[PDB]
Design a protein around this nucleic acid. Structure first.
Length: 49
DNA sequence: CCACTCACTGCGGGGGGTCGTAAACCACGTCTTCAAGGGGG
């Protein structure tokens, strides 16, 4: 849903800096979607030794 | 309104008193095999 909203307002917006920021954000979101990693795994609950 | 910096950041060259357990044994002992010797040049 975040990707959908970002795509819509990217198609809507006219400012170029917003376009660059949102294309970076969309790249990150699609990377998470395709890779399979979960976002919450960046917070550690088990620490290896 | 988005232009146009500029400050910013990151990158290379202290007392005592009890308790339980893997150490920590000195007696414990009887077993082994230490065996004195035995005969066939």
């Amino acid at each position: 849903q975040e990707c959908e909203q970002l795509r819509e307002e990217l198609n809507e917006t006219n400012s170029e800096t917003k376009r660059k920021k949102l294309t970076k954000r969309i790249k990150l979101l699609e990377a998470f979607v395709q890779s399979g990693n979960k976002p919450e795994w960046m917070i550690l609950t088990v620490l290896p030794v």
